[PDB]
Amino acid sequence: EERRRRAAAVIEEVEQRFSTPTALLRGIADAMVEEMERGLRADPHAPLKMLISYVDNLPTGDEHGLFYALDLGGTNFRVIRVQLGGREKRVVSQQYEEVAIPPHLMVGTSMELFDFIAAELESFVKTEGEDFHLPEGRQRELGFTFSFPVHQTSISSGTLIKWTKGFSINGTVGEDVVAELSRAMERQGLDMKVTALVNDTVGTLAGGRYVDNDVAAAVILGTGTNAAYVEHANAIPKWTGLLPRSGNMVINMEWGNFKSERLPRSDYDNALDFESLNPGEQIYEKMISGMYLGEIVRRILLKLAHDASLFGDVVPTKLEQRFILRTPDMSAMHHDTSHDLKHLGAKLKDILGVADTSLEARYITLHVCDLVAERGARLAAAGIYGILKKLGRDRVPSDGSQKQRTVIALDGGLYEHYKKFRTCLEATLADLLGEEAASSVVVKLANDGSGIGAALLAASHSQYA
Numbered sequence: 001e002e003r004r005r006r007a008a009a010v011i012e013e014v015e016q017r018f019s020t021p022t023a024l025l026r027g028i029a030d031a032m033v034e035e036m037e038r039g040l041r042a043d044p045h046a047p048l049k050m051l052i053s054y055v056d057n058l059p060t061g062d063e064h065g066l067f068y069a070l071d072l073g074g075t076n077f078r079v080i081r082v083q084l085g086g087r088e089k090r091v092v093s094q095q096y097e098e099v100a101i102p103p104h105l106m107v108g109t110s111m112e113l114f115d116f117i118a119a120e121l122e123s124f125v126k127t128e129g130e131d132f133h134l135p136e137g138r139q140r141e142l143g144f145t146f147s148f149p150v151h152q153t154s155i156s157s158g159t160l161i162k163w164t165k166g167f168s169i170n171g172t173v174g175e176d177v178v179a180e181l182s183r184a185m186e187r188q189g190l191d192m193k194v195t196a197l198v199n200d201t202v203g204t205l206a207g208g209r210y211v212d213n214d215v216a217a218a219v220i221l222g223t224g225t226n227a228a229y230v231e232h233a234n235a236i237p238k239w240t241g242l243l244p245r246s247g248n249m250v251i252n253m254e255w256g257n258f259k260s261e262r263l264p265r266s267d268y269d270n271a272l273d274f275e276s277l278n279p280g281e282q283i284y285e286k287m288i289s290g291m292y293l294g295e296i297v298r299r300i301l302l303k304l305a306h307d308a309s310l311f312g313d314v315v316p317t318k319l320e321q322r323f324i325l326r327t328p329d330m331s332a333m334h335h336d337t338s339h340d341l342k343h344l345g346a347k348l349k350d351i352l353g354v355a356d357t358s359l360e361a362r363y364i365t366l367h368v369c370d371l372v373a374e375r376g377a378r379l380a381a382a383g384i385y386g387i388l389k390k391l392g393r394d395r396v397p398s399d400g401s402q403k404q405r406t407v408i409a410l411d412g413g414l415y416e417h418y419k420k421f422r423t424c425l426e427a428t429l430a431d432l433l434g435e436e437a438a439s440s441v442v443v444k445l446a447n448d449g450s451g452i453g454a455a456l457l458a459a460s461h462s463q464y465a
């Protein structure tokens with residue numbers, strides 16, 4: 001019908017506003033570096049907070065002993081327990097338990113949340129355990145990974161800046177999250193001391209360098225997105241005090257808050273933000289991260305349903321319901337290669353509650369996913385490139401000459417389980433780099449990286465008991 005061109009008009013503006021020509025990506029990468037410097041001198045209201053992590057020395061390998069970690073993410077939390085054995089034996093025993101965070105605890109009271117966590121820890125610690133031992137008369141020490149922006153005050157203390165993703169708990173901003181976790185643990189009451197507080201990007205970069213000494217930065221691409229890297233302490237103007245022996249400092253960029261007029265946004269992006277739980281915050285992250293991609297697709301699919309009767313002559317009711325299309329569902333449809341888009345069709349039936357779908361409609365749906373997933377992955381690649389620019393690792397020496405080896409640790413369901421996203425990410429990154437510098441850059445999955453990473457940092461910062 002003539003619908004067909006009204007539908008093409010919509011898809012045309014999507015392609016047009018989501019366009020990321022590499023020329024635009026280089027400009028975005030330059031913008032990201034400018035913001036990393038604005039954040040490092042603590043310019044007022046800089047988008048990138050560039051938070052000093054108090055981690056001046058990353059894991060070496062010569063850590064030994066029994067140490068726990070608590071890993072609080074946007075969707076789940078883990079209770080980890082490792083037994084380290086030096087540079088030779090490394091991780092001798094590992095035990096972990098992962099729990100999904102009940103949705104109400106992302107938006108209730110802080111006591112409700114930390115009591116829920118602490119109680120899962122208390123009962124996990126009692127499953128210990130013949131393989132892990134702690135000298136007699138000692139306290140167990142814990143690494144705390146906190147996947148939200150924290151203004152740090154010591155390796156083990158820090159204030160909450162704001163929540164992100166789907167969390168919004170009153171009365172917790174400004175408070176010390178380790179103190180909040182410790183009272184929960186005494187209400188439990190377990191004798192445990194938190195010796196390291198780290199963001200999940202900072203923890204992933206620790207866990208990553210424990211296995212590969214070439215890790216210079218870690219990027220999370222999961223339910224949220226953020227990045228951390230190793231900066232030279234003498235490159236941080238906002239720094240006060242003695243610099244560290246090592247001369248380095250791991251910076252939590254908090255790059256989801258990146259905003260820039262160069263970012264290719266659309267009305268679907270403004271609508272998502274206007275109805276988000278944190279309006280105006282984390283602009284960049286809402287173009288990239290797993291909490292948001294599926295909802296961008298739903299909002300594009302809904303305009304087509306209405307302006308092009310794409311799914312019938314009445315709009316399916318479920319398609320008007322926010323967050324009904326998650327990002328894993330998007331990923332399942334996007335990877336269907338059956339001649340008639342049979343699986344993508346089955347998902348649309350469940351998600352929209354229709355009985356059947358056209359086959360033109362499924363190709364448009366699949367094209368809508370491709371437009372959304374690829375603007376997110378190309379932009380994430382521009383960010384990684386910016387980090388490399390800031391490390392002077394977008395260039396290759398010079399004479400020629402030994403090339404460096406620079407590893408990036410990645411974690412998150414987007415990078416780990418969304419295959420076209422990861423591919424587009426790495427091809428764009430390689431293409432921003434050059435066949436040359438590219439050969440020196442490694443991108444690794446650093447699974448469950450944040451927790452052992454926190455556990456290891458909690459160790460090098462023990463009270464020796």
Ligand SMILES: OC[C@H]1O[C@@H](O)[C@H](O)[C@@H](O)[C@@H]1O
Nearest residue numbers: 147148149164220224225226
């Ligand atoms: O979950 C990964 C990232 O998501 C961001 O929204 C959080 O604010 C970061 O602290 C975290 O590193």
